[PDB]
Amino acid sequence: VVIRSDWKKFFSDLQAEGAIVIADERQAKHTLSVFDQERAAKRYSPASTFKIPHTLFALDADAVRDEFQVFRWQDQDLRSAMRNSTVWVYELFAKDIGEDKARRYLKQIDYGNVDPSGDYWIDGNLKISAHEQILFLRKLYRNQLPFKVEHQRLVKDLMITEAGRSWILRAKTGWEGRFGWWVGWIEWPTGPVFFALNIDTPNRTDDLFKREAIARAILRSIDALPPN
Amino acid sequence: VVIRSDWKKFFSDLQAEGAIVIADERQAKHTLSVFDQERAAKRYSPASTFKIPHTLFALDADAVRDEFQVFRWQDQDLRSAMRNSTVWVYELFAKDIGEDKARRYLKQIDYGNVDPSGDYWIDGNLKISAHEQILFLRKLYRNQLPFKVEHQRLVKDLMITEAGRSWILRAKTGWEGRFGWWVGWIEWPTGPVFFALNIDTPNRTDDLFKREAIARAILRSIDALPPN
Numbered sequence A, B: 001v002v003i004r005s006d007w008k009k010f011f012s013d014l015q016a017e018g019a020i021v022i023a024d025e026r027q028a029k030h031t032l033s034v035f036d037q038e039r040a041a042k043r044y045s046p047a048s049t050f051k052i053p054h055t056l057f058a059l060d061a062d063a064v065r066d067e068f069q070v071f072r073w074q075d076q077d078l079r080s081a082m083r084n085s086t087v088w089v090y091e092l093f094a095k096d097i098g099e100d101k102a103r104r105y106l107k108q109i110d111y112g113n114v115d116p117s118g119d120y121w122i123d124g125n126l127k128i129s130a131h132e133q134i135l136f137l138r139k140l141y142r143n144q145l146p147f148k149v150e151h152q153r154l155v156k157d158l159m160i161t162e163a164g165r166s167w168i169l170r171a172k173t174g175w176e177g178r179f180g181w182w183v184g185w186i187e188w189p190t191g192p193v194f195f196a197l198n199i200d201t202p203n204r205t206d207d208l209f210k211r212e213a214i215a216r217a218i219l220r221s222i223d224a225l226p227p228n
Helices: A008-012 A047-060 A078-083 A088-108 A130-141 A149-158 A209-221 B008-012 B047-060 B078-083 B088-108 B130-141 B149-158 B209-221
Strands: A018-024 A031-035 A160-163 A168-175 A179-188 A191-200 B018-024 B031-035 B160-163 B168-175 B179-188 B191-200
Touching (some): A008 A209, A018 A130, A018 A209, A047 A078, A047 A088, A047 A130, A047 A149, A047 A179, A078 A149, A130 A179, A149 A160, A149 B149, A168 A209, A179 A209, B047 B078, B047 B088, B047 B168, B130 B149, B149 B160, B191 B209
Antiparallel strands (some): A018 A031, A018 A191, A160 A168, A160 B160, A179 A191, B018 B031, B018 B191, B160 B168, B179 B191
16 A cells, blocks of 8 residues: 555645545556545545446346436436436436345445445445445456446446547546545556545535546556546 | 438548448437448458457357456457457467358358458458448447347447547458458447448558548548547
């Protein structure tokens, strides 16, 4: 665990309080870098980062079949639902899964708190840490979650925000109101670089841009994003 | 079939002889646009565009397991092999599959000529047309090829050359020596736009850039690529 006092700079440059864990797996030897080890180990409601395991649950439970399936009531497929902030599709999924399957699903994947007591992933008691996001993400990357490999591939395809010839960025934001996240990874020919940042958002919507901004400055600093 | 005399301009702007089929599925009604219907229906050796069905064959036949599997003799995974021009990995796959499984695989997917008589996809008798590329690509997109859905997803993930928030470009070039291709699609929230261009390459390596260049000018002309 490499304690990154060299990365505080990116946080304070934007007046931000947060933590980040990056796991750089591009060399034969893997490092684990951390800013605020303590906050990194703290557990926070995932919010919309939960869309990643939640889609695996919905797919497993056949709450949704396909990338092609349309939900009406403006029509969402699984890709628009992943990419947007409209809440009803995932709320639908939760109702169709129920608290018990969710419960068991959460223990199966060992997702933080594992406890789903409105929406359980923002308004309930479910909580995960930056380190726990990293461990989960890496399992999904290696296709080792207890889900069909096709569902894992699908979800990983839904998470694409950006790509070039050599690299694929697969990532998800979340915001609880008091704090927000950005998690995901970027793949390079030699391997991935996982990231999971949370920060506090005292200035609310005006702080949201700092999620990706801070993480991106850090990733450019270790050559894990292209120049601009 | 909408005959695109409005697209000749992009071909001659680069002194090029070729055809293109685009299938725009972004509206409830699908169109099929074509430049040179006749050459569009003609069959040409796929060359490296064959890497797309060939990877499905290798995966099915467990010639390769995984995105993670490494081939030695510089080490290739399935992603580097897809992205590069180094020939030995796919030649390996062919030997492990043999002419008979290849044969049956080709008939199963109804891939052009269906006949694998060095490398059969550049030096043999296998041949497919721009229209036949389009039909195959659309099957892969809908997950309706006779292969596990996970293998289809994988191959579709290997084909990513580029992406943004809203769009994913999944594409493959080929060159035979006398002619070259670019095929693939780009996905938008409302649906994909399939493309398959071949052109002659009398000036050899100096003509190769025209494959993507012509197709891209066309796709920008119908708003199916971002501005630049």
